[PDB]
C-alpha cells in the first residue's frame, strides 16, 4: 500500500526537521554582530562593450582574467578583450535562440546552447584559424538552461526536462544522468574542487549532487518561488540562492540549514543573477528593475548600488582574481565595474 | 535697423511715419536671440545622446544647425552696407544657409511620406541620399545664380539680393515649391490620421481626438516651415499685418522647435533624467 | 509503488548524516573572510597604478 | 609589439564592418509567431504556402522578408523564462471552426495566450479555418446544442460566424493595444499571404502614426 510509504516519507521528513531544529543553537547575525561594517562601496564603470544587435542573455569570464564571451539573441557569440576593448572572434550560430554560454578553463573551447535542445562545442584554436563546430551534444528533451566545463573533455549540462547530464565530448554520449528534480532546472554551480555541484529548479528546491557516484546528497528548501541563480562560496562549504520572491538566501552544507536572508521592503522584483566576491564578504545580485545591489554577506546589509543599465540585467560575473565585475543587460551592452 | 520681413519682399516697401519699423526690428532681435539659445540647446540634445539616433534625428539636427548658423549671420552682418567687400559675402552666406534649411525642411515631408505611405523600411541606407540632396541643392542654386549675376548680392539698404531685376526670385521660388510640396504632404498626413483614428480607439469623445490632431499639426508646422507664406503677401503699408505675422511666427521658430521636439517628448526627458 | 519507495529510500539516505552546529559554521565563514580580506581588490580599493582598467 | 596591436585593431574593425552590414538586414525583418493545435491545420497551411525543438520558415511577400516560428512541442512550457518572443511583430492563431466540442478549449487557450504581460506590444491575427466544413454543418448540426447563450437563427452561416468572432474577441482585456484581425480561410486558399501582409502593414502604420500624435 502506498499509504505506508507516504507515512514513511512523512516520518523521515519529521525526523530531518527535528534534527535541524536540534542543530540550531545560534544565528549568524548574533555571532557576526560586533564585526565592523564594510562601509560604502562606490564602483565606477571602466569599459563599455558595444556591438551586439539584440538582447544579451549570458556571459562567462576567462580564467586568464582578460577574455570573456557573451551570447545574444541575434544569433552570434563574441569574444572580447577587456583590457583593450577589442573583438577577437565572431561566431555565427545555427539557432537564433541562445540562453547559455560557457568558456573552457584552458581557453581552447566554447560551449553554447538554447531552445534547440543541443549543446555545441566550438574549437577556438584550430588549424587555419577558422572557428568551427567540433561536437553537437544531442539527447535532451528540453531547452538547455545551463552548462559548465570540467575539463577539455567533460561538460555538465542542465535542461528544462528536470534532468542534468554529464557528457563525454570525444564520444558524445551521456556518462551520467542526475534525476530527481520536479520542476525545470534553471541554474547550476560547480564546486571549486570539481567533485560536487549544486542545482536549482522551478520547484523552489536546491540539491547537492555527486559527480562521481551520480546521486543526490542533500535537498535545501525555503524559497517561496522559482530559483533563477545559484553560486558557490569561495571555500566551498556554502552557497547562495536567488529567487523570484525578491529574496536571496545563504545555505550551509555541513549544517544542512539556512543561515541568512538578504531582502528589503523596497525590493519587489525577482533576482536574475547572483555572484560572490573573492573573499566572500561581498554578495552581488542582479535584479530586473534595471539595477544591481551589493550586500554584506556577514551582516546582511546593503553596501552599494550599480545603476548604469537602462534595461533588465540578465547576467553577472566576477573575475577570478577579483579585480573587475562585468554585467550584461537587455540593452545590448556590457559594462565593466571596478 | 532692418527687420526679418526683408527676406520675403519682392517689392520695395515704403514706410509711412510711424512705429512699425522700430517694433518690427525689436521683435526680430528678441525672437532671434531666444531662438539662438533654444537652437543651441536642441543641437546639443540631438548630437549628444546615442539613444535618440535614427533617420529623423539627423534631419532634425541638420535643420537646427543650419537655422542657428543662418540666424547668427543675419544678426551679425545685415546692416554692414558701409563695407564694400563684406556685404556681398554676407548676402551669399545668408542665401546658402537659408536654402539649406529649407532643403532639410523638404526632407522632413519626404520622411513623412516614407513613414505613412510606404510603411516598411528599405534594404539600403538613405542617409547618404539625404546628405547629398540637402547640401547639393543649395550649392547648385547659389552657384548658378552667382554665375549669371554676381553684382546683385548687395543692396544700398541691406546685405541682401536685388529686387528691381528679379534676383530675389532665385531665393523665393524654391521656397514656394517646397511649401507646396509640404502642403501636399501635410494634407496626406492629416487624411491618414483622420481615417486611421477611427480604427484604433474607434469610439471616443470627438473633442479629445480634435485636440490630439491639432497638437500634432502644430508640432508638424514648425518643421514643415509653412508659416513663411505670410511674407509673400506683404506688398505695401495696407497689408502690414502680414509682416507682423511673418516676423512673429518665424523669428520664434527655434523656440517652437525646442518646445515641441525637446520638452514635450518623453524620450528626451527620460534621457535627461538618466543624466541625473 | 516504485516511485514512493524510491522517495522513501532517498529520504532515508538524506536523513542520516553528521550535522554540525550552526555557530561552528558561522565562525568558519567569519574566519575565512578575515583571513582572505587583504586579497580582495573590490573590498579594499587599490591604487590606480596597479589597476589594469 | 606594434604589429600585434595593428593586427588586433584590424580584426576588430573587420568584425565591426560585418556587424554593421548585417544590422540593416536585421532592422527590416518581420517575425510572426505561429500557434494552434493539431486539428487547426498548421501542416497543410505551411505546406500549401507556395511562397530540433523550434522550426522556422522563411518567405518573401512583395520584396519583404518574413519569418514564421513554430514552437510546437515546446509550447507546453508554462514558465516565464519561455517568453522570449517579445520582439515579434504579430501572432498568428489557427483554430478549427467546424468542431464545437473543442471550441471552448480553443477559447481558453486564446485567453491564456493573449492575456500575458509580455505580449503587450504585439498584434493578434486570428484565422478561422474549415469554413467549407462549417457550411455543411450549420444546417445538420445546431450550434445552439453547445452554446445556449447566443441569439439568432442557427442555420445561417453568417450569424454563427459573427457569433464565433464575438466569442473570440470578447476574451481580450487589452482593448487599448495593437488591434485584433480575423479572417475566414480554408487552409488551402491561395490568398493567405496577402492578408498577413496587409495586417502587418496596418500594425506598423499604427506604430508610425502613434509617434506623430505626441501620444
Ligand atoms: C558657400 C558659398 C555659397 C559662399 C560663397 C559666396 C558666394 C555666394 C559669392 C557669390 C557672389 C560673390 C561676391 C561677388 C562680388 C564680390 C566683389 C569682389 O570685389 C570681391 C568678392 C565679392 C564680395 C564676392 C564674394 C563671394 C560671393 C558673395
Ligand atoms: C538647380 C537650379 C538651376 C534650380 C532652379 C533655380 C532657380 C530658382 C534659379 C536658378 C538660376 C536663376 C536665375 C539666375 C539669374 C537670373 C537673371 C536675373 O536678371 C533675374 C533672375 C534670374 C533669371 C534667376 C532666376 C532664378 C533662377 C532661374
From Swiss-Prot, chain A:
Changing residue 78 to N: In MRD42; also found in patients with acute lymphoblastic T-cell leukemia; reduces interaction with GNAI2, GNAI3, GNA13 and GNA11; induces activation of PI3K-AKT-mTOR and MAPK pathways. This is Guanine nucleotide-binding protein G(I)/G(S)/G(T) subunit beta-1. Changing residue 78 to T: In MRD42; also found in patient with hematologic malignancies; reduces interaction with GNAI2, GNAI3, GNA13 and GNA11; induces activation of PI3K-AKT-mTOR and MAPK pathways. GO terms for biological process: adenylate cyclase-activating dopamine receptor signaling pathway; cell population proliferation; cellular response to catecholamine stimulus; cellular response to prostaglandin E stimulus; G protein-coupled acetylcholine receptor signaling pathway; G protein-coupled receptor signaling pathway; phospholipase C-activating G protein-coupled receptor signaling pathway; Ras protein signal transduction. Changing residue 62 to V: In MRD42; decreases receptor-driven G protein activation; decreases protein abundance; decreases complex formation with gamma subunit; decreases trimer formation with alpha and gamma subunit. GO terms for cellular component: cytoplasm; cytosol; extracellular exosome; extracellular vesicle; heterotrimeric G-protein complex; lysosomal membrane; membrane; photoreceptor disc membrane. It comes from Homo sapiens (Human). The keyword Acyltransferase does not apply. The modification Phosphohistidine is found at residue 264. One of its GO terms (molecular function) is GTPase activity.
Swiss-Prot record, chain B:
Residues 79-84, 151-167, 236-239 are extracellular. Residues 50-57, 106-129, 189-214 are cytoplasmic. Orphan adhesion G-protein coupled receptor (aGPCR), which mediates synapse specificity. Ligand binding causes a conformation change that triggers signaling via guanine nucleotide-binding proteins (G proteins) and modulates the activity of downstream effectors. Following G-protein coupled receptor activation, associates with cell adhesion molecules that are expressed at the surface of adjacent cells to direct synapse specificity. Specifically mediates the establishment of perforant-path synapses on CA1-region pyramidal neurons in the hippocampus. The chain holds residues 825 to 1099 of 1459 of the full protein. Belongs to the G-protein coupled receptor 2 family. Adhesion G-protein coupled receptor (ADGR) subfamily. Expressed very widely in all normal tissues tested. Expression is variable in tumor cell lines, apparently elevated in some lines and absent or markedly reduced in others. The chain crosses the membrane at residues 29-49, 58-78, 85-105, 130-150, 168-188, 215-235, 240-260. This is Adhesion G protein-coupled receptor L2. The gene is ADGRL2. It is found in: Postsynaptic cell membrane. Autoproteolytically processed at the GPS region of the GAIN-B domain; this cleavage modulates receptor activity. It comes from the Eukaryota. The lineage of its organism: Eukaryota, Metazoa, Chordata, Craniata, Vertebrata.
From Swiss-Prot, chain C:
GO terms for biological process: adenylate cyclase-activating dopamine receptor signaling pathway; cellular response to catecholamine stimulus; cellular response to prostaglandin E stimulus; fibroblast proliferation; G protein-coupled receptor signaling pathway. It is found in: Cell membrane. It is a lipid-anchor. Keywords: Acetylation, Cell membrane, Host-virus interaction, Lipoprotein, Membrane, Methylation, Prenylation, Transducer. Expressed in fetal tissues, including testis, adrenal gland, brain, white blood cells and brain. One of its GO terms (cellular component) is plasma membrane. GO terms for molecular function: G-protein beta-subunit binding. Guanine nucleotide-binding proteins (G proteins) are involved as a modulator or transducer in various transmembrane signaling systems. The beta and gamma chains are required for the GTPase activity, for replacement of GDP by GTP, and for G protein-effector interaction. Belongs to the G protein gamma family. This is Guanine nucleotide-binding protein G(I)/G(S)/G(O) subunit gamma-2. The chain holds residues 9 to 61 of 71 of the full protein.
Swiss-Prot record, chain D:
It is found in: Cell membrane; Melanosome; Cytoplasm; Nucleus. The gene is GNA13. It comes from Homo sapiens (Human). G proteins are composed of 3 units; alpha, beta and gamma. The alpha chain contains the guanine nucleotide binding site. Interacts with UBXD5. Interacts with HAX1. Interacts (in GTP-bound form) with PPP5C (via TPR repeats); activates PPP5C phosphatase activity and translocates PPP5C to the cell membrane. Interacts with RGS22. Interacts (in GTP-bound form) with ARHGEF1. Interacts (in GTP-bound form) with ARHGEF11 (via RGS domain). Interacts (in GTP-bound form) with ARHGEF12 (via RGS domain). Interacts with CTNND1. Interacts with GASL2L2. Interacts with GPR35. Interacts with GPR174. Belongs to the G-alpha family. G(12) subfamily. Expressed in testis, including in Leydig cells and in the seminiferous epithelium, in differentiating cells from the spermatogonia to mature spermatozoa stages and round spermatids (at protein level). Expressed in 99.2% of spermatozoa from healthy individuals, but only in 28.6% of macrocephalic spermatozoa from infertile patients (at protein level). GTP binds at residues 129-132, 187. Residues 185-190 are annotated as: G5 motif. Residues 125-132 are annotated as: G4 motif. This is Guanine nucleotide-binding protein subunit alpha-13.
Amino acid at each position: 500500500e502506498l499509504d505506508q510509504l507516504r507515512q514513511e516519507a512523512e516520518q523521515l521528513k519529521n525526523q530531518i526537521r527535528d534534527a535541524r531544529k536540534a542543530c540550531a543553537d545560534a544565528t549568524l547575525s548574533q555571532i557576526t554582530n560586533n564585526i565592523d561594517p564594510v562601509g560604502r562601496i562606490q564602483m565606477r564603470t571602466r569599459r563599455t562593450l558595444r556591438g551586439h544587435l539584440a538582447k544579451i542573455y549570458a556571459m562567462h569570464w576567462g580564467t586568464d582574467s582578460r577574455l570573456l564571451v557573451s551570447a545574444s539573441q541575434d544569433g552570434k557569440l563574441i569574444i572580447w578583450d577587456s583590457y583593450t576593448t577589442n573583438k577577437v572572434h565572431a561566431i555565427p550560430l545555427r539557432s537564433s535562440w541562445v540562453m547559455t554560454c560557457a568558456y573552457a578553463p584552458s581557453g581552447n573551447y566554447v560551449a553554447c546552447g538554447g531552445l534547440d535542445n543541443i549543446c555545441s562545442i566550438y574549437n577556438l584554436k584550430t588549424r587555419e584559424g577558422n572557428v568551427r563546430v567540433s561536437r553537437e551534444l544531442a539527447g535532451h528533451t528540453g531547452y538547455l538552461s545551463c552548462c559548465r566545463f570540467l575539463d577539455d573533455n567533460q561538460i555538465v549540462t542542465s535542461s528544462g526536462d528536470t534532468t542534468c547530464a554529464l557528457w563525454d565530448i570525444e564520444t558524445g554520449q551521456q556518462t551520467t544522468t542526475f534525476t530527481g528534480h520536479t520542476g525545470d532546472v534553471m541554474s547550476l554551480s560547480l564546486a571549486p574542487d570539481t567533485r560536487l555541484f549544486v542545482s536549482g529548479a522551478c520547484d523552489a528546491s536546491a540539491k547537492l549532487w555527486d559527480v562521481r557516484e551520480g546521486m543526490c546528497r542533500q535537498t535545501f528548501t525555503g524559497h517561496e518561488s522559482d530559483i533563477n541563480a545559484i553560486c558557490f562560496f569561495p571555500n566551498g562549504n556554502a552557497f547562495a540562492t536567488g529567487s523570484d520572491d525578491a529574496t536571496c538566501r545563504l545555505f550551509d552544507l555541513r549544517a544542512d540549514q539556512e543561515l541568512m536572508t538578504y531582502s528589503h521592503d523596497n525590493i519587489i522584483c525577482g533576482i536574475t543573477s547572483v555572484s560572490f566576491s573573492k573573499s566572500g564578504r561581498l554578495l552581488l545580485a542582479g535584479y530586473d528593475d534595471f539595477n544591481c545591489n551589493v550586500w554584506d554577506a556577514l551582516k546582511a546589509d546593503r553596501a552599494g548600488v550599480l545603476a548604469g543599465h537602462d534595461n533588465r540585467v540578465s547576467c553577472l560575473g566576477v573575475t577570478d582574481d577579483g579585480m573587475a565585475v562585468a554585467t550584461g543587460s537587455w540593452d545590448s551592452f556590457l559594462k565593466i565595474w571596478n | 535697423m532692418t527687420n526679418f520681413a526683408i527676406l520675403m519682399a519682392h517689392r520695395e516697401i515704403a514706410y509711412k511715419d510711424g512705429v512699425h519699423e522700430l517694433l518690427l526690428t525689436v521683435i526680430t532681435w528678441v525672437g532671434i536671440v531666444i531662438s539662438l539659445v533654444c537652437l543651441a540647446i536642441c543641437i546639443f540634445t540631438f548630437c549628444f545622446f546615442r539613444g535618440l539616433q535614427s533617420d529623423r534625428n539627423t534631419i532634425h539636427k541638420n535643420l537646427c544647425i543650419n537655422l542657428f548658423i543662418a540666424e547668427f549671420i543675419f544678426l551679425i552682418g545685415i546692416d554692414k552696407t558701409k563695407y564694400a567687400i563684406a556685404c556681398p559675402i554676407f548676402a551669399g552666406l545668408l542665401h546658402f544657409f537659408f536654402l539649406a534649411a529649407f532643403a532639410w525642411m523638404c526632407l522632413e515631408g519626404v520622411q513623412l511620406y516614407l513613414m505613412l505611405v510606404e510603411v516598411f523600411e528599405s534594404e539600403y541606407s538613405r542617409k547618404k541620399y539625404y546628405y547629398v540632396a540637402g547640401y547639393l541643392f543649395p550649392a547648385t542654386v547659389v552657384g548658378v545664380s552667382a554665375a549669371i549675376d554676381y553684382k546683385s548680392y548687395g543692396t544700398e539698404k541691406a546685405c541682401w539680393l536685388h529686387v528691381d531685376n528679379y534676383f530675389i526670385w532665385s531665393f523665393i521660388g524654391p521656397v514656394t515649391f517646397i511649401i507646396l510640396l509640404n502642403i501636399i504632404f501635410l494634407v496626406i498626413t492629416l487624411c491618414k490620421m483622420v481615417k486611421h483614428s477611427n480604427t484604433l480607439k474607434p469610439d471616443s469623445s470627438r473633442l479629445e481626438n480634435i485636440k490630439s490632431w491639432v497638437l500634432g499639426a502644430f508640432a508638424l508646422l514648425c518643421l514643415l516651415g509653412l508659416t513663411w507664406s505670410f511674407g509673400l503677401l506683404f506688398i505695401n503699408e495696407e497689408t502690414i499685418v502680414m509682416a507682423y505675422l511673418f516676423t512673429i511666427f518665424n523669428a520664434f521658430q527655434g523656440v517652437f522647435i525646442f518646445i515641441f521636439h525637446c520638452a514635450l517628448q518623453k524620450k528626451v526627458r527620460k534621457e535627461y533624467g538618466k543624466c541625473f | 509503488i516504485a516511485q514512493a519507495r524510491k522517495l522513501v529510500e532517498q529520504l532515508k539516505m538524506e536523513a542520516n548524516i553528521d550535522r554540525i552546529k550552526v555557530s561552528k559554521a558561522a565562525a568558519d565563514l567569519m574566519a575565512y573572510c578575515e583571513a582572505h580580506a587583504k586579497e580582495d581588490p573590490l573590498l579594499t580599493p587599490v591604487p590606480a597604478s596597479e589597476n589594469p582598467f | 609589439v606594434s604589429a600585434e596591436d595593428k593586427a588586433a585593431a584590424e580584426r576588430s574593425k573587420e568584425i565591426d564592418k560585418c556587424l554593421s552590414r548585417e544590422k540593416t538586414y536585421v532592422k527590416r525583418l518581420v517575425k510572426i509567431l505561429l500557434l494552434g493545435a493539431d486539428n487547426s491545420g498548421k501542416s497543410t497551411f505551411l505546406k500549401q504556402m507556395r511562397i530540433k525543438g523550434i522550426h522556422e520558415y522563411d518567405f518573401e511577400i512583395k520584396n519583404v522578408p518574413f519569418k514564421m516560428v513554430d514552437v510546437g512541442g515546446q509550447r507546453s512550457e508554462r514558465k516565464r523564462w519561455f517568453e522570449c518572443f517579445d520582439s515579434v511583430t504579430s501572432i498568428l492563431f489557427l483554430v478549427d471552426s467546424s468542431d464545437f466540442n473543442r471550441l471552448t478549449e480553443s477559447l481558453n487557450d486564446f485567453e491564456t495566450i493573449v492575456n500575458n504581460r509580455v505580449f503587450s506590444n504585439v498584434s493578434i491575427i486570428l484565422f478561422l479555418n474549415k469554413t467549407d466544413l462549417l457550411e455543411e454543418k450549420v444546417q445538420i448540426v445546431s450550434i445552439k446544442d453547445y452554446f445556449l447563450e447566443f441569439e439568432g437563427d442557427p442555420h445561417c452561416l453568417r450569424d454563427v460566424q459573427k457569433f464565433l468572432v464575438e466569442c473570440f474577441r470578447n476574451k481580450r482585456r487589452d482593448q487599448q493595444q495593437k488591434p485584433l484581425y480575423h479572417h475566414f480561410t480554408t487552409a488551402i486558399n491561395t490568398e493567405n499571404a496577402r492578408l498577413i501582409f496587409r495586417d502587418v502593414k496596418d500594425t506598423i502604420l499604427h506604430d508610425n502614426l502613434k509617434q506623430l500624435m505626441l501620444q
